[model samples]
Target: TCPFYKKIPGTGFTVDAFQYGVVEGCTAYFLTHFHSDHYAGLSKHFTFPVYCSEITGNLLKNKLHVQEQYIHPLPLDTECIVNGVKVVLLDANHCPGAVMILFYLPNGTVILHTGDFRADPSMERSLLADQKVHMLYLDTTYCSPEYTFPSQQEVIRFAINTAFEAVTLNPHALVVCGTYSIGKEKVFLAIADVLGSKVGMSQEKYKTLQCLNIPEINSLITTDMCSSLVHLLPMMQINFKGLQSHLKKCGGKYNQILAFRPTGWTHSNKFTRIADVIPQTKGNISIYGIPYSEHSSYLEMKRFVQWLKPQKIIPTVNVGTWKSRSTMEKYFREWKLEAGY
Candidate 1:
């Protein structure tokens, strides 16, 4: 029931809108990532052929328990015709296999879906820059001007330094590195590499990183609180002093647990012209939210729209009704003017 879910006018190729709500005649389907919200309802039902990257397909197979026969790989850097429309998968620079999609519609429209992407200047070299995008399905996750931060690389360095300092200064304190389903391996991997330790992660994440093929990481399926100098857990899992909850059952031990939230949210309100990595503390939680975010910030979104100059824009979230459409249109109008529509 999201506005982002829709069919290409003249074709049967359905977009991200999966079985969550059910769509009648569709020959093929495409997904942007392996996030829970992305594949919401499809978890219960399977069998439709899905077009996505190899990593994304693997996550669907390994994590989602979807049948292998239903998943198909969509290669990046080039175009492939799926059920009559031409689509090219471009690196979204958000996750291991996150991608922004470009569709050459049958109606002579060029549509782009930035599936949770960050603005990378490298994109200018890709084939994407040369096209006139008619409509854009944007990842306006931080569409407000208040949000800004440094790039992922700088953030990784910040994490490396943070972990290094934490380990050296307070070896007794537990360094709880937090992340979501499949993003921010850079933070943990960097920490592990510098600290000479194996990354303790859930079996699901270990499998995903293995598929992603970073041999240097030396990850593991572990909850051994003290075995590794650091522990990696999904941020959403720990709300209260609950991180101690993991080790409580095993009788494992550690000193004070300092939560590190490596996210881009730290730049909110304190916006910056550069994607600068700024680490701050909020009680027990350290805000290190890096430029590792999967979606574009307001400035990035502005630059992207200016680059593509699409005829129309559709923000992927918070717009599922007619009233919400007005809100979405406001974003579209604001962006349109910014991009000199």
Candidate 2:
């Protein structure tokens, strides 16, 4: 469930609330990214105008087949006035079209709504550096002290090198990289580039990739069976049973299979370093869950909040139940009181 009830307080803007039909007295709806969780309720029947990044707009039209006239693509860093409130889109750095929305309310309150973000130094160098945020709607996907993990760069390098090594050891090995519908393209793409092999995916997945507008990726993706040793599949399909069926379907094109589930959820505070991580294996099948996350780590989130020093912080996730939601809020309170802000 979405915290803040999907409505930005002190304004008529409702964000990522398609799941709940037509917010009352809402003047506009904002989409943070193309992920299904955020854009779950959008469809052709939606009548409200949606404000999003250019890439998200294209994804809504092509992938979800939403009506084009209702989609308004907002340019990044540029301010646009919607009805009365001023809105600006900044790169969320989570997905292809994800943006952290900055809203200048009519009451002179500067509210920053971060949909889902991986905190980076560049964000502190953005417009937030020059202003005082009265309210911050933050993404609490990793708002706990237990989620400190290696950076995406380190995890990506590990994934690429691991895939290369697996194939080098067995030239006929199949490397299956598990991914979501949109994000995690970079991991597999880099692996494909390193192995000098094209990526295999379903025909429908290929159509969704077309909207991404990456020319180099087009040359690297092929749906034809056995044309490439590297294949992209859903994260749920990375287990032994799934890989077994996939191998049988390929008709003995490869003797061994190596699967990489590159996601942040694989991280545990028990491991202090990336190299300390281990892979789960069963005979000819090997499964590795890399700590390659798209969301900010606990430390990164603390630094971001400390830098901005917003007057009020509101979490946008883990709000379904009172227990989990309040537990997350405690961290925010602790972080805020630590610096005596």
Candidate 3:
């Protein structure tokens, strides 16, 4: 009673149907993170109970509002049995709810899968010390040594300093910065803290930041915060054209306007056109290019590989399949190969 012939549908050989079947008889499935690429396939087809950390589950429930019938939440560092396999989810420092998964087979093979992870000194101590990993499936998205990113605190400081300088130059200007709804909320919080007052935030932005539970850095300056500062000023729209008009209007009354955008507008040819639209005489325009990427740089990934010292290293999440594989094989060949398959 097979739904369809499992042998490539058209080929004649009897391939294992479980390989393509969503509800195949695998021991368990572990979710590394809630990113669309990693989780979307499973979410659409698999009905099996999946395991992940509680933080990841909370993020999916609160942020994405995923239905409960599809999830099975596990606590950090705790082990759980699925079918016959043991699974453990470890913290992955890339984002708030990300994780690295470890699978322990009954026959003693231990597989470690590191999802998108950054070497944030504060959060990566445990990952760097784990030595029992035998097979490592790694995220080698940035597997070249040239892509260096500054620290998170450095990025925050750059954003804050740039905003302060913009405001100081033009006191009556309106500033608008672009950031993703959830990821770049830190930039907005930094601005509010430096301004030492509440700032206008859209309902969606407000709710997202609150759910993250960051320390209260500043208050929310709704129109109700102050009638004078509130009624005279218009709420800045978080878009390109809207920001331009807002800045021009504020320039008429104030010396300059300050706005923050989380994207690297200067780096793209498309965004460069928007940058040209800013009135050169009204106020100085600055496009900050601070390094605030979520993924680990190449050096950090190498360091992680060295620390884990896994017997077999498998690199995933990159394009140019054969070329990528060849590059990694070359690197591993020169290094003293670890013991075990």
Candidate 4:
């Protein structure tokens, strides 16, 4: 019963519940992505069978040390029968190997568990859009009025332009992008595409990227730190102190550091202009918090709920506190009312 976990009613399937450990009656486990928060508590000694996309399955075996015997890699956008229940895996558009699990139970219940997602317009073409979803396990990380922000494309362009301008101002400035283990690869990929530069990442990150099997990212990655000015580091390393130490180690190869911390938390204020990318400067080290979120915005979440018109909405995030869950329920009620339900 963790805030990030869900147990599908009327089925033996549990989604992202490795952290909860051997929940009673959970015969199968579904992993949405390889992000640490979602994949926590998973180990090589897992007793149940794990179902995820091929990319995520690879990560589980290669990165998380999960055994291959228990891993079942399902194909995207295709229906398959799992333990007598019909299920489909659709692209979640959140990160590499992420998927939205759709279940059609024997009792006529249709459920969708979107682990974590950015609701894109292309998703309307999904077969689920044509049917009534009984329950929607939503990613409610930003399901509030104050969390609306810019689109992913807008933020990517902003990131590319910001890097371009930074290099133009000081050609010796090294661009560092903050990224999670599996998500936020596009921000740096887009920046590298525009800057015509290779990317520098640690050996471990490169191995994870190789599991993703994306040639573009694989070809762009370089183990040599000095070869590429744009280095991909974990989000925690983008701070002033972290960048200062990294720059000192660079040994005069780069004059300054321009870092991009791409996540949704930086633009949570409702009143701020959407186009603004907040910047913090510390002499030669400059940090910009770009609103390049992988999760859906408040408006996008409302729209997805309205479009899918799910009979029930169950939040998968912010469920630890009663007040937060109550507020999210309020939004759900308001949205259902507006959708004429």
Candidate 5:
């Protein structure tokens, strides 16, 4: 069972079951995003309708395949009501369907939930000045000072430049990049922008992008169109032996091979070595590292908490356990604010 209120005690609330039947009498339960950690309880027990941004509903339907009857989708920046609570869904900038939720209660209390948002300048500038939030449910996944992440633009640029270098070095070589099928659309777009009409999308990716209304990117070629330009494939399709065989099959035609992997590339040394097997004609594997992520960093989290000036700050997700809670308390203590559930 999930620990619902360990950190935030005495709220008289427990996030149990799929149907949030209790939510009917109380104020609305604002959802920041459609991630499993946040939505799992809702989908399982909350048969009553919940609210979110229209895009989020689409994502829920398209990505999670959530049933329509349980959703009350609102357009971005639009206000809606759920069980007498007022909610507005703002762009989270973390992923396509993510949202920063604002709750306006009848008691004149204003609560802001950051969900899993990155503090991109555009997003911060848009929301900070407008909202006068009294309580903030902050995402403290990277609250520790040691945690650092590069800007989204920088990560995008790295992927694009690396792809270009791989293709230029060996025209006939196939390039593969790893990404979560749902969240890495931006990475693909950045790569396409870099390729300048040379990159192609796989049939699967093409269809998916089309459904999302992602415009055709220049320089992108799919695995099917690989023969025409350079071929790009998802990293999942190629195993070590399969990569070796594919490289051998394309022998002497391409100069270099490039592939991108997700967590396995960073966490496991063995996986890193496995990632290095494919190579150029001289048999040298070229791997570019991009620390691209979809969540807010330490500084961003701090700034968000500061701006909200909330009476309480609660952390969600596995990373926001007691250890993380302690770190946040220290931060708030420095600012002379009490931290609690």
Candidate 6:
């Protein structure tokens, strides 16, 4: 049980819980995406019929071995009315299968779950701009100025170009990409498409990428380690001793190793511009630490709040009543003097 679960005023709509237990028996469950932190306790025995995108449903059934009968698919931009409440799914732009949950309560209360999304100007033209978010359960993971970074597209370019440069310089080197199982597919896919090479990943990631159906991308998916020159490794396993030894001794071909870590935490400075492309290098390894983050920055989060104008803010990461609220207000008070307001 996390700090973000809630009841829809009078109705029984639990938000993002696969392994439902204890208090707040839900009428139905709503999963934002296939991220594990939201479904921390979810297991193969998870019996609840969770509602999410078709891709997430595929993950639950194919990867986690959940029964198909208990998994419901919620298509994007479509409204599904169940138990008198209207639920609308909107694109979250976080990763494939990620979405923002907009619940229209019977009492006219709108509960919006900003499911780890990065907001852009294109959203202004969408139908979501007309809807008023009464309560916001926000993805405040980067709700501080300390988490500033560039746009996803710009970072994707940097990541792809950096990989191209590394491979061009040293043909014997292997580009070890650090990414999540499901998130950060854009950078890898772009690299593959531009380089005209296949990207190697785990069988788990291959299935998820294939189901996403992005053309020219999944066509390059391979579970084989050396199907192509590039190797996509998970963030945790990227710098491991065993991975390094295996890459070195496999054919002794990878005399040099270049790692491109696409994350926001690399630029912790408050004043790092959105267009900055500063990469750090060490020994034979060069990590771009690209700013292709899914979450919004302090200013971006403030702008999102300004747009939604929620009655109250519920920071999903650390859901403290006053402590979290106070920290949020502090960031808001001094936001105008910095970059974009």
Off by over 4 Å in 1: 1-5, 217-226, 236-240, 245-253, 264-292, 320-331, 334-341
Over 1-341, each residue of candidate 2 has an lDDT whose tens digit, in order, gives 34465788887788888887767878788999988888988888889899999989988898888898999998999989887778899999998888999988888888899999999988988987898899888898888888788888888888888889889989989999887768878888999999999999988888888887879879999898578888988889999999988888888778899998876665464555777766889889999878777899889999999889889877887767798788887887887889788
TM-scores, one per candidate: 0.83, 0.94, 0.70, 0.94, 0.74, 0.87
Q: lDDT score of model 1? A: 0.70
Candidate 3 lDDT, 1-341, residue by residue in tens: 22221111111211122234453343344566656555554433445555676656665556666667766787777777655556667777666667776767666777776777775544446633554877777777767544555556766877677666666665654444564433544665667567554655445655554554445522543333222111112223443455556556443554344454444212342243322333223234333334466777666766667656778876665635788777767765544344212
Q: Write the per-residue lDDT of candidate 4 for residues 222-244, one digit (tens) a residue.
A: 88988887898888988999999
Clashing pairs in 1: 116-294, 149-275, 149-276, 150-275, 150-276, 262-289, 263-289, 263-290
Please, what are the lDDT tens digits per residue for candidate 1 over residues 273-295?
32344555545444454445666
Off by over 4 Å in 4: 1-5, 267-271
Off by over 4 Å in 6: 1-5, 19-23, 211-213, 240-243, 267-283, 320-323, 329-341
> All models: lDDT?
0.70, 0.85, 0.54, 0.85, 0.56, 0.72
| Model 5 misplacement above 4 A | 1-31, 34-36, 41-47, 197-211, 216-242, 245-255, 262-284, 319-321, 335-341
TM-score between model 2 and native: 0.94
lDDT for each residue of candidate 6 in 23-57, tens digit (9 for 90 to 100) = 36576777788888776556577766678888888
Span of 10 residues, lowest total lDDT, candidate 5? 7-16
Cα-lDDT of candidate 3: 0.54
lDDT by residue for model 5 (231-341), tens: 445665444554555566564565445665533113433243332434323255445444566777777766666555667666664444577667677876665444232
Model with the higher TM-score, candidate 1 or 2: 2
